[PDB]
mmCIF file of N, CA, C and O in Angstrom:
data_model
loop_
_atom_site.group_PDB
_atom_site.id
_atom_site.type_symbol
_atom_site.label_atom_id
_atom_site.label_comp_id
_atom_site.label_asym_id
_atom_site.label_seq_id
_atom_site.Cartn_x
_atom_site.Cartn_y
_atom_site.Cartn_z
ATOM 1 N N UNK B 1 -4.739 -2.420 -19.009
ATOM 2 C CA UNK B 1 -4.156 -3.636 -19.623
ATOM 3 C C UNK B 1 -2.641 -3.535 -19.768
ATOM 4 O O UNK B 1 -1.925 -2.959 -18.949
ATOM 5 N N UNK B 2 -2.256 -4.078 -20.760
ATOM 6 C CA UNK B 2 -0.417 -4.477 -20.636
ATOM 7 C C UNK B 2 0.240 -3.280 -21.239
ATOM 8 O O UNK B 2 1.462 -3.139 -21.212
ATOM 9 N N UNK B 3 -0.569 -2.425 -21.779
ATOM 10 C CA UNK B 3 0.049 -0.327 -22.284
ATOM 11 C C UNK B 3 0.293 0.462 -20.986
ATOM 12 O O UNK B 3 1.010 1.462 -20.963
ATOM 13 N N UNK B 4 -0.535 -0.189 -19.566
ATOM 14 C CA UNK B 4 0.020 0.491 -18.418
ATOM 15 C C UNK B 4 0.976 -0.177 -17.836
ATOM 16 O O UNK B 4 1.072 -0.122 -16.610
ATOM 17 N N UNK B 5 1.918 -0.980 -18.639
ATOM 18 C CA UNK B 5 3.194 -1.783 -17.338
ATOM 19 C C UNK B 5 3.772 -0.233 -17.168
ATOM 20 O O UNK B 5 3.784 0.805 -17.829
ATOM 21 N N UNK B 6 4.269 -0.735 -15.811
ATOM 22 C CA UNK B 6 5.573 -0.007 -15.604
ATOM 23 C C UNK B 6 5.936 0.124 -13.905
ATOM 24 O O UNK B 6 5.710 -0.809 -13.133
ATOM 25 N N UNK B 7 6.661 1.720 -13.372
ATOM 26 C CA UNK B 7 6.820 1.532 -12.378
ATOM 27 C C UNK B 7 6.134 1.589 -10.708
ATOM 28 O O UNK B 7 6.728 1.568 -9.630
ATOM 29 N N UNK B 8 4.458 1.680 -11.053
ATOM 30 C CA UNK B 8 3.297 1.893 -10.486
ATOM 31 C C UNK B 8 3.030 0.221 -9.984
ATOM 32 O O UNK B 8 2.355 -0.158 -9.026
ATOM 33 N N UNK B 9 3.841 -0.659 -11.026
ATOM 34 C CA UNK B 9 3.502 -2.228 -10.126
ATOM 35 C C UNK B 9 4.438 -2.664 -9.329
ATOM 36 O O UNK B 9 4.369 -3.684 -8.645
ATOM 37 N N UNK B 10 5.636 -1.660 -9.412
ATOM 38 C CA UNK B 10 7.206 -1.517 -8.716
ATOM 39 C C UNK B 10 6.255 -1.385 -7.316
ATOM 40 O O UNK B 10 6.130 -2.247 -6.446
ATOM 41 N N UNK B 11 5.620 -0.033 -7.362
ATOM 42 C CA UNK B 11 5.692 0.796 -6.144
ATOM 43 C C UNK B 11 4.583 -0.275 -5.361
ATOM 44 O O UNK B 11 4.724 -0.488 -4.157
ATOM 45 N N UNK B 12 3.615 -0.847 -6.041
ATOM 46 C CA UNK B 12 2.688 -1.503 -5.604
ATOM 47 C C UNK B 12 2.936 -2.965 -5.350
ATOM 48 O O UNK B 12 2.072 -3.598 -4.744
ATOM 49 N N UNK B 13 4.295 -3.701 -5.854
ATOM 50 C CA UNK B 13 4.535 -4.418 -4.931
ATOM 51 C C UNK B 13 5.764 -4.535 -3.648
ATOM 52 O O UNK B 13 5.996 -5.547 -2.986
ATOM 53 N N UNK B 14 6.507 -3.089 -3.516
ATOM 54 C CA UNK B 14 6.869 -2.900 -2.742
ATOM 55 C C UNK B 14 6.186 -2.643 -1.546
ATOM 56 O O UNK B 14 6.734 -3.067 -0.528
ATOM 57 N N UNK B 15 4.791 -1.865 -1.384
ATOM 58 C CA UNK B 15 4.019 -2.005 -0.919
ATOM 59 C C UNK B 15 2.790 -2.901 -0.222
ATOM 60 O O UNK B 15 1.987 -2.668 0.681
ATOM 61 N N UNK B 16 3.033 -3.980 -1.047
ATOM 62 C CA UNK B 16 2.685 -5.146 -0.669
ATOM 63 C C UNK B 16 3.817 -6.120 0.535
ATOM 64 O O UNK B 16 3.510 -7.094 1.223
ATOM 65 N N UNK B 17 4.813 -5.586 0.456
ATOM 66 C CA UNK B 17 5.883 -6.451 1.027
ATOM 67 C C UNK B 17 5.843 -5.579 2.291
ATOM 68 O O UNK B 17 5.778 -6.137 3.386
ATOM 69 N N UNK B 18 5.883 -4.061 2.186
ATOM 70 C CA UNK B 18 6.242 -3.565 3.376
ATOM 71 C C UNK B 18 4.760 -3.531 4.534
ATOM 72 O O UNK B 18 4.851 -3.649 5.756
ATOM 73 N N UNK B 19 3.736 -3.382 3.921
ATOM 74 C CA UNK B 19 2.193 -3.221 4.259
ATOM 75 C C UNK B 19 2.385 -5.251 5.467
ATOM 76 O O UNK B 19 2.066 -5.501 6.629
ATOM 77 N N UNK B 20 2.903 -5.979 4.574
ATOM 78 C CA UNK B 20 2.811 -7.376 5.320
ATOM 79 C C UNK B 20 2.874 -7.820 6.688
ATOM 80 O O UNK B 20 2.262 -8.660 7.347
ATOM 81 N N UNK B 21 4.107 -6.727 6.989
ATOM 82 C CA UNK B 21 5.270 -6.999 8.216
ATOM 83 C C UNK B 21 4.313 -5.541 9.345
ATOM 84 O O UNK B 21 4.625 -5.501 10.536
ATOM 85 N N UNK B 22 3.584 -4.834 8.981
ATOM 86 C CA UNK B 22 2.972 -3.953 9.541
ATOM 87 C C UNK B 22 1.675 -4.946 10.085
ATOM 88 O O UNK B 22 1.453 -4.965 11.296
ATOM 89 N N UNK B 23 0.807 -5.788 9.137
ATOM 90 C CA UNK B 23 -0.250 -6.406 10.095
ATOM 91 C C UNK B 23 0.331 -7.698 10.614
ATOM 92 O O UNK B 23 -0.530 -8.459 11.057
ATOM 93 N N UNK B 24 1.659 -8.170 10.677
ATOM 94 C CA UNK B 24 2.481 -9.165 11.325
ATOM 95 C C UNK B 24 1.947 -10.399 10.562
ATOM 96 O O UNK B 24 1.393 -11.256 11.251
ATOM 97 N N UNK B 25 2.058 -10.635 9.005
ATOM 98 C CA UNK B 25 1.529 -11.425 7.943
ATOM 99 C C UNK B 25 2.527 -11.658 7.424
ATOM 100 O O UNK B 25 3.557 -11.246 7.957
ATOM 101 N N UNK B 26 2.593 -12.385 6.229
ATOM 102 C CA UNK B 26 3.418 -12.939 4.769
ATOM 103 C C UNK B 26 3.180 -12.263 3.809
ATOM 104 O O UNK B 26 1.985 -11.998 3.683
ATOM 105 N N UNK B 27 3.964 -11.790 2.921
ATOM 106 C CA UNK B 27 3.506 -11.194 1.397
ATOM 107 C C UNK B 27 3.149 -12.236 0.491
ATOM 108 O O UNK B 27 2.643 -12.147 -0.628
ATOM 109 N N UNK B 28 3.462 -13.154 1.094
ATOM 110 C CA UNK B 28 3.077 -14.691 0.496
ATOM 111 C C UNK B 28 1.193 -15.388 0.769
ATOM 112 O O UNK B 28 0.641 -16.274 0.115
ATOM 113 N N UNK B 29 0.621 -14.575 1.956
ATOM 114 C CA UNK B 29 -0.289 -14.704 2.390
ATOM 115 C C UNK B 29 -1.272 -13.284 1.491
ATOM 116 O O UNK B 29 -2.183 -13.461 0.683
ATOM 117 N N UNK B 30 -0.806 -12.166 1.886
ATOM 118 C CA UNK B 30 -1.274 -10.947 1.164
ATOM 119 C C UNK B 30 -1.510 -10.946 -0.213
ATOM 120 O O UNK B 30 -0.498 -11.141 -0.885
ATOM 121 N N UNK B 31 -2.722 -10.757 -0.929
ATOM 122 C CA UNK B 31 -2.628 -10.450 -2.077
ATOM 123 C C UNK B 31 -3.153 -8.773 -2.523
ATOM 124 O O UNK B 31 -4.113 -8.314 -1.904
ATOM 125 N N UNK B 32 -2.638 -8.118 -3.350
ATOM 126 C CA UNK B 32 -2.369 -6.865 -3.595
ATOM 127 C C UNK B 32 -3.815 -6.135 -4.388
ATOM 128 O O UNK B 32 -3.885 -4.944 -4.691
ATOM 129 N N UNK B 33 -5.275 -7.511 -4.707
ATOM 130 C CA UNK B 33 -5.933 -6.605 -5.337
ATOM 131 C C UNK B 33 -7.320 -7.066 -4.263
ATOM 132 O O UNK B 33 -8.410 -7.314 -4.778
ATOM 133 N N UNK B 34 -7.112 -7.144 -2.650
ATOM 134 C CA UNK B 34 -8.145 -7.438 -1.914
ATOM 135 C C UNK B 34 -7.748 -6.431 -1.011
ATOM 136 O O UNK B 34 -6.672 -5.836 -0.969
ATOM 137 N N UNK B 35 -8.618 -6.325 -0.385
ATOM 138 C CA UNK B 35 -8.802 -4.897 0.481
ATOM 139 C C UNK B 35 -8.591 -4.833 1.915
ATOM 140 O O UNK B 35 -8.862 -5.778 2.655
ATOM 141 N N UNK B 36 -8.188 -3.904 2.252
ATOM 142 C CA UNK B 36 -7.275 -3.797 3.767
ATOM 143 C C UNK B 36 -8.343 -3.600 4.543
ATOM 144 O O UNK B 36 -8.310 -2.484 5.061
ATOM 145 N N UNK B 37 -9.651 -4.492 4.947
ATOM 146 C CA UNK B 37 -10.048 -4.694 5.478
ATOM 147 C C UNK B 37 -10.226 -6.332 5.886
ATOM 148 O O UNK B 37 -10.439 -6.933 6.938
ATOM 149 N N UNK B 38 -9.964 -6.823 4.090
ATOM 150 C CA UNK B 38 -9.504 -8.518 4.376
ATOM 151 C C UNK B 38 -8.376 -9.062 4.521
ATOM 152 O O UNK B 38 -8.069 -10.248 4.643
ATOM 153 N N UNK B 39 -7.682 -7.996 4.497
ATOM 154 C CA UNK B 39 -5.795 -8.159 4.866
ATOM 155 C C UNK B 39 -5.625 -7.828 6.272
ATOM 156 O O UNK B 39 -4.508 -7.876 6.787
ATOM 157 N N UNK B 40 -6.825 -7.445 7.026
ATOM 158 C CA UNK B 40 -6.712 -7.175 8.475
ATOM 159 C C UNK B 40 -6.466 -6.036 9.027
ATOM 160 O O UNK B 40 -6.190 -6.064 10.226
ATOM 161 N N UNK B 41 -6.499 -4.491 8.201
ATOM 162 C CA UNK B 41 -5.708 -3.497 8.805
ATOM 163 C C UNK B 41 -7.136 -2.910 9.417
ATOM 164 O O UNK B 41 -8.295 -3.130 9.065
ATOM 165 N N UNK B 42 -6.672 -2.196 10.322
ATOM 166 C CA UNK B 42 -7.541 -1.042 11.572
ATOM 167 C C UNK B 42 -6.396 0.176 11.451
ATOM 168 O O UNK B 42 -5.316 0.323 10.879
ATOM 169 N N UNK B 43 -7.382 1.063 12.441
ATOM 170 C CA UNK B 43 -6.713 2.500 12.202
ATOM 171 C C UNK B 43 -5.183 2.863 12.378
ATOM 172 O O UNK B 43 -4.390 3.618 11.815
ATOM 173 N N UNK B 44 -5.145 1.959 13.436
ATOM 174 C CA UNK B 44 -3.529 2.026 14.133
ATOM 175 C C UNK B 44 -2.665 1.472 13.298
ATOM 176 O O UNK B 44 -1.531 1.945 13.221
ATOM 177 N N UNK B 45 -3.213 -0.108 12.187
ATOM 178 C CA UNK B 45 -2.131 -0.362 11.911
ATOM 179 C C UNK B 45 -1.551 0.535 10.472
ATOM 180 O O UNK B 45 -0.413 0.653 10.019
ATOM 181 N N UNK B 46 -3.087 1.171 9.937
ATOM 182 C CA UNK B 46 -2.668 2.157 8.936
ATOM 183 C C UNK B 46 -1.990 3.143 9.155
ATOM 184 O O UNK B 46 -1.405 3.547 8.150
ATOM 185 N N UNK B 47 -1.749 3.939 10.427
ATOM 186 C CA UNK B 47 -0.970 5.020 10.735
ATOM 187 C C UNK B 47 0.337 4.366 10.565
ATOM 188 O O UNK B 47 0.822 4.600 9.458
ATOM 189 N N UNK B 48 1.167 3.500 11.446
ATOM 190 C CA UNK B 48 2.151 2.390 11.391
ATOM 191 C C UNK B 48 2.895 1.945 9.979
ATOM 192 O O UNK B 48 4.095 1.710 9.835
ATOM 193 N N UNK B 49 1.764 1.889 8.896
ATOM 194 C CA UNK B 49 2.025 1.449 8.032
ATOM 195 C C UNK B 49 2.539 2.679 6.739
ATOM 196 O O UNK B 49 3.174 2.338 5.740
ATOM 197 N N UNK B 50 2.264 3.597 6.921
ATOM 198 C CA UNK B 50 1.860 5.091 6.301
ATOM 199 C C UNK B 50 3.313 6.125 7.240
ATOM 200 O O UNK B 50 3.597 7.260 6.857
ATOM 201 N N UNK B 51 3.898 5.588 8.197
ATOM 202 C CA UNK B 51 4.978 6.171 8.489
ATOM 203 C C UNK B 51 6.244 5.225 8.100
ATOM 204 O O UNK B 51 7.371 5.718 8.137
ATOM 205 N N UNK B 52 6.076 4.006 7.765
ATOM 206 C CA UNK B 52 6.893 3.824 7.307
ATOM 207 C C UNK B 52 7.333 3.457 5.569
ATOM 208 O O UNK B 52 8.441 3.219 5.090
ATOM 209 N N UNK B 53 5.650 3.546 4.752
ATOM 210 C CA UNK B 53 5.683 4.519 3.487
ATOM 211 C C UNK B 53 6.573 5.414 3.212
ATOM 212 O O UNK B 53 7.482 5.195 2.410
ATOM 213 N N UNK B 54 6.380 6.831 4.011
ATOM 214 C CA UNK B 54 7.094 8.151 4.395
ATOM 215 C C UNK B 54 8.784 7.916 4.367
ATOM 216 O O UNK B 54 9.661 8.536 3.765
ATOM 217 N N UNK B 55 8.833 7.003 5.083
ATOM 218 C CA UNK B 55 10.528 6.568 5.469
ATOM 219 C C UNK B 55 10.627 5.751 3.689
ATOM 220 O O UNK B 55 11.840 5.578 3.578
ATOM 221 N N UNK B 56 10.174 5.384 2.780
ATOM 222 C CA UNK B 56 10.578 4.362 1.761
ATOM 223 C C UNK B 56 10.436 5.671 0.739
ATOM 224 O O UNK B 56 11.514 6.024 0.262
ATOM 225 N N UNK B 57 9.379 6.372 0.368
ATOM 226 C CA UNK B 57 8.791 7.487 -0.651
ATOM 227 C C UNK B 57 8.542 8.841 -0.087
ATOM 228 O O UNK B 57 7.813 9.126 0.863
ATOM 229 N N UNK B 58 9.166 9.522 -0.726
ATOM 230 C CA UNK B 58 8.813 11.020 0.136
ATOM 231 C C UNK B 58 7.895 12.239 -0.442
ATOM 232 O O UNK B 58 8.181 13.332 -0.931
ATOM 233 N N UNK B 59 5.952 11.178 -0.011
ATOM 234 C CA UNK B 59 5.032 12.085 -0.743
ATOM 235 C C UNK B 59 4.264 12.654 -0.030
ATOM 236 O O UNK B 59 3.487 13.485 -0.501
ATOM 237 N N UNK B 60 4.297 12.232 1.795
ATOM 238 C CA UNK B 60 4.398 13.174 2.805
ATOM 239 C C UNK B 60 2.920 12.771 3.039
ATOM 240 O O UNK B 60 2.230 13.350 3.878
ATOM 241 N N UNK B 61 2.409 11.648 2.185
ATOM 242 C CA UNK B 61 0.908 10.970 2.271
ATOM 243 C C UNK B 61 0.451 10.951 3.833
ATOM 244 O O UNK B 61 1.377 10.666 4.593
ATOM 245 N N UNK B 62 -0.634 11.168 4.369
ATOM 246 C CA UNK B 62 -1.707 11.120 5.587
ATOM 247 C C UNK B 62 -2.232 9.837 5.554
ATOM 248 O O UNK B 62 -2.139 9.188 4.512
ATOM 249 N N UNK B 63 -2.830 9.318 6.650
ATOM 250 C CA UNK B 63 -3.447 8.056 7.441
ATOM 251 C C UNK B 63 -4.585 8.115 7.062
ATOM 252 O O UNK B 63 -5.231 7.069 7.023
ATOM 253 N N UNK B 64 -5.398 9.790 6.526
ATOM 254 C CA UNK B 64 -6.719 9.785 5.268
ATOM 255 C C UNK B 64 -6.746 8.670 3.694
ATOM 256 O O UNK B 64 -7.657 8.261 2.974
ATOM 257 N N UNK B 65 -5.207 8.498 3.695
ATOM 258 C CA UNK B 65 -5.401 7.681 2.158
ATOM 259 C C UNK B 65 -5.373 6.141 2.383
ATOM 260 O O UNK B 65 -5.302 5.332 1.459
ATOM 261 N N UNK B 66 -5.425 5.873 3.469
ATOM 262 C CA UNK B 66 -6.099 3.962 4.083
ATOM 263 C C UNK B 66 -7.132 4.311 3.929
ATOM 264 O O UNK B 66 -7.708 3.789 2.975
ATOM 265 N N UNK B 67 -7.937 5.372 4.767
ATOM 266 C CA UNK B 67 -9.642 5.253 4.571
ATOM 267 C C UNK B 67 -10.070 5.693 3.006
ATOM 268 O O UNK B 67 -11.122 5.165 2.646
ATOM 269 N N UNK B 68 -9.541 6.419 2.185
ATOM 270 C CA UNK B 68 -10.031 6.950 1.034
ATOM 271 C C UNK B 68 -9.577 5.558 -0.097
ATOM 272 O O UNK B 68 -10.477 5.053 -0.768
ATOM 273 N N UNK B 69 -8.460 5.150 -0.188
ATOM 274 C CA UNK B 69 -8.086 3.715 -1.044
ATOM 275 C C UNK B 69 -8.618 2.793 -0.492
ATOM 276 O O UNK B 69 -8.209 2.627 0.658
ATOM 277 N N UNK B 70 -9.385 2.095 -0.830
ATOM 278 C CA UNK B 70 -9.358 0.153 -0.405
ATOM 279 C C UNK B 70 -8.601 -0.486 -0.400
ATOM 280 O O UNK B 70 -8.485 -1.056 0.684
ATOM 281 N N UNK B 71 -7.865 -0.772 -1.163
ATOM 282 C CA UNK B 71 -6.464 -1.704 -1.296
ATOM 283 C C UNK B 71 -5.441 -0.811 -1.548
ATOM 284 O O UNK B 71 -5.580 0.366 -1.879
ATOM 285 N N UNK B 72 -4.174 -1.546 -1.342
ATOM 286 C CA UNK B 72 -2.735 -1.897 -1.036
ATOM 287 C C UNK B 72 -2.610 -1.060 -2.774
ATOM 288 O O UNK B 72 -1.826 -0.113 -2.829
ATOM 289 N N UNK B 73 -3.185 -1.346 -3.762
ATOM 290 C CA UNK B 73 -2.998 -1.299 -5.241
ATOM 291 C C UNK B 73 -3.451 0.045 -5.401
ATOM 292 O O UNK B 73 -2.633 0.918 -5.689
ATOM 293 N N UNK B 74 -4.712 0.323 -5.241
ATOM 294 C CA UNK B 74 -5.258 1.439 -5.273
ATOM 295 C C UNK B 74 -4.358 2.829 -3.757
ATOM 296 O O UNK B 74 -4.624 4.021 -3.912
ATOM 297 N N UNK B 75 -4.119 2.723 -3.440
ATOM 298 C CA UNK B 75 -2.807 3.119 -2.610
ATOM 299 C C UNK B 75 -1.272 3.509 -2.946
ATOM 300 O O UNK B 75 -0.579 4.506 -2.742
ATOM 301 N N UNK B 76 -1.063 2.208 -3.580
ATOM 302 C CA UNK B 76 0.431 2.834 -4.638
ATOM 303 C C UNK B 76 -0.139 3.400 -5.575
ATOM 304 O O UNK B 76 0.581 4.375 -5.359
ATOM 305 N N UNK B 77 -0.937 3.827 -6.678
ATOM 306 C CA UNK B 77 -1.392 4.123 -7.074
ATOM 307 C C UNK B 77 -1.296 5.574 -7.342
ATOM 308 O O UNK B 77 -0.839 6.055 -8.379
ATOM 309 N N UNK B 78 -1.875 6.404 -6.079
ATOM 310 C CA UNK B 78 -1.819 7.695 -5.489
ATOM 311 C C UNK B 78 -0.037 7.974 -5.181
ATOM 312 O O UNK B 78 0.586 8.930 -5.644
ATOM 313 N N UNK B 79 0.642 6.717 -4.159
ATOM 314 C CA UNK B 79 1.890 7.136 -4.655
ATOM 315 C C UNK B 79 2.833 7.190 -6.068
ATOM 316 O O UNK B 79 3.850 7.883 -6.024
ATOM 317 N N UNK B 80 2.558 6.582 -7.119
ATOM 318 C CA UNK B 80 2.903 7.005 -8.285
ATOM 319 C C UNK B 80 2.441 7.674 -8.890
ATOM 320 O O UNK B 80 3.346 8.053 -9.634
ATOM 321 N N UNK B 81 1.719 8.083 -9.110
ATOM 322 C CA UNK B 81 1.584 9.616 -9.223
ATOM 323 C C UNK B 81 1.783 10.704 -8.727
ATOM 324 O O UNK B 81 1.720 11.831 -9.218
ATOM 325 N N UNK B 82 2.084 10.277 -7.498
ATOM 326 C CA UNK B 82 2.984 11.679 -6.830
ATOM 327 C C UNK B 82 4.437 12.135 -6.954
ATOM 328 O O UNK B 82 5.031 13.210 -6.878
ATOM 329 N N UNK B 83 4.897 10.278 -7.279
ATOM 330 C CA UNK B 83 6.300 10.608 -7.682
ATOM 331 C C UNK B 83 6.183 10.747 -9.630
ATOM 332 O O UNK B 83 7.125 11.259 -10.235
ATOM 333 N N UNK B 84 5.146 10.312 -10.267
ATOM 334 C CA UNK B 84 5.118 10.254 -11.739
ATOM 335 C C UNK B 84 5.697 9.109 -12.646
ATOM 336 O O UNK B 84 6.138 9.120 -13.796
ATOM 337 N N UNK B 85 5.554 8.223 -11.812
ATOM 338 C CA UNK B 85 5.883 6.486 -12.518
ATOM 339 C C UNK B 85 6.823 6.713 -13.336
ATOM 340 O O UNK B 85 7.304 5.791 -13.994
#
């Protein structure tokens, strides 16, 4: 609820913006708590999308954390906590 704001909805909607332009979409179209299977991603575009993560956050995350997260949310997620919100 509203005791977890902070910078975990930063990372998660930066992630939403950059994740967009990877399946050639809108962040305006994307919403951040449906799953990257209804946002359209496949294996390739998660690798694609996960190197250029790497280039924004430096948590050195694998193309394993598309298949292990469902969503875009649950995804930043794992990256704030790696950097510690």
């Amino acid at each position: 609820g509203p005791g977890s704001a902070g910078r975990q909805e930063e990372i998660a909607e930066e992630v939403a913006r950059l994740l967009a332009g990877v399946l050639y979409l809108e962040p305006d179209r994307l919403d951040p708590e449906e799953t990257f299977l209804t946002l359209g991603v496949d294996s390739i575009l998660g690798v694609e999308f996960v190197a250029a993560v790497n280039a924004a956050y430096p948590v050195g995350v694998k193309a394993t954390a598309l298949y292990d997260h469902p969503t875009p949310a649950a995804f930043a997620r794992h990256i704030a906590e790696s950097l510690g919100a």
